[PDB]
Amino acid sequence: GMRYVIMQSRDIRENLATEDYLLNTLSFEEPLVLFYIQEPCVILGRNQNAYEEIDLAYAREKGIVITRRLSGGGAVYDDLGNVSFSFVVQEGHQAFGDFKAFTKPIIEALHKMGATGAEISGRNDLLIDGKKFSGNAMYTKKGKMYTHGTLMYDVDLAEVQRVLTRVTNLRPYLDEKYQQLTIEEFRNRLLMELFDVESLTEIAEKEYVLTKADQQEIRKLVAEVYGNEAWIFGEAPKFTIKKEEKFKGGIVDARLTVEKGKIIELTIYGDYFAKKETTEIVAALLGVDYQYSSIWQALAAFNFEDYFVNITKEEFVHLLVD
Ligand SMILES: O=C(O)CCCC[C@@H]1CCSS1
Ligand SMILES: [Cl-]
């Protein structure tokens, strides 16, 4: 039943908007697989601090496009040596955070293309010979989700390290016949492995082609979100207290203003994954007494599996107040 979309743009902002738009107009009838390629860019996780993750002056110098995605996780640098994939599907009860199930077909395709021993590790990365060639993230909204990931074929690894504040390319591990492909050919071969065919003509009717009504709405998302300075960089947090810890589920970085024993301002940054927006947690804490019992009580009704995957409510409250 799956369909596919090959994005034509080389702009990360248009490609993310396309994914956003396709998730928001998905039918249960057909899940999608998306493939997209873009020019030098950095993509921030949903709750990351732009100013701490990127060397902005260097990105500015080199014309590296900065944006922010809807999924959690960390910062990624992409260039024309990367292809990104996305599985857009109806969310089953167990599905969110199950990177093993969602990356299985990519691993199997890569194994078939000669990259044997490729495996999932650190929960959301794909490794080969102990080295990361892919990071993955998930987003869900209203029972629909995507899992999207990078595949480093011929990324400039030096540039990755320079613009962000063990990794590897796939090319050396693939069979000889796949070792001198264009990034487009690499993408197309992956696609063919996923649908278990020899040529694209065997699945041309499974392509979904973006209409002009689609393109118009995507254009609006780029203006309002993915190219929007307010969305990308966010407002400066007002704070005198910073609490940062690494948990099983990633880093949480909390910035607080406390006055007369009450929380007046709170900003939460991190690279955790989440089904729901962190803004709801912040809204519940504003004006609350800055003490464990009062903070816990304010968050009593929240299911923390929804807000911070693999970080407990107790951990979070202790972070805020210890
Ligand atoms: O590994 C992480 O922590 C984040 C990975 C995010 C992958 C996204 C793919 C399409 S845009 S960036
Ligand atoms: Cl909980």
Short mmCIF file of C-alpha atoms and ligand atoms in Angstrom, two decimals, residues 12 16 36 43 69 72-74 76 78 84 124-125 132 135-137 148-150 273, ligand 1:
data_model
loop_
_atom_site.label_atom_id
_atom_site.label_comp_id
_atom_site.label_asym_id
_atom_site.label_seq_id
_atom_site.Cartn_x
_atom_site.Cartn_y
_atom_site.Cartn_z
CA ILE A 12 15.93 21.95 3.38
CA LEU A 16 10.79 19.94 5.71
CA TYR A 36 14.94 14.32 0.05
CA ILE A 43 18.64 21.32 11.10
CA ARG A 69 12.31 20.63 12.49
CA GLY A 72 13.11 16.15 18.79
CA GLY A 73 16.70 15.02 18.89
CA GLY A 74 19.95 16.75 18.09
CA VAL A 76 22.31 17.70 12.03
CA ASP A 78 23.38 17.93 5.66
CA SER A 84 17.17 11.85 3.99
CA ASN A 124 18.32 6.20 17.19
CA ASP A 125 21.62 5.94 15.22
CA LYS A 132 27.57 6.41 12.77
CA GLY A 135 20.66 9.69 12.89
CA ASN A 136 16.89 9.34 13.21
CA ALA A 137 14.00 11.22 14.83
CA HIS A 148 12.90 10.53 9.40
CA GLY A 149 16.61 10.01 9.16
CA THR A 150 19.82 10.95 7.44
CA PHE A 273 12.13 13.06 21.96
O1 LIG B 1 19.98 11.91 15.56
C1 LIG B 1 19.34 12.87 16.06
O2 LIG B 1 19.37 13.18 17.30
C2 LIG B 1 18.48 13.71 15.14
C3 LIG B 1 18.35 13.13 13.73
C4 LIG B 1 17.37 13.95 12.88
C5 LIG B 1 17.31 13.48 11.43
C6 LIG B 1 16.47 14.46 10.57
C7 LIG B 1 16.23 13.90 9.15
C8 LIG B 1 15.54 14.96 8.25
S1 LIG B 1 16.02 16.57 8.79
S2 LIG B 1 17.23 16.06 10.35
#
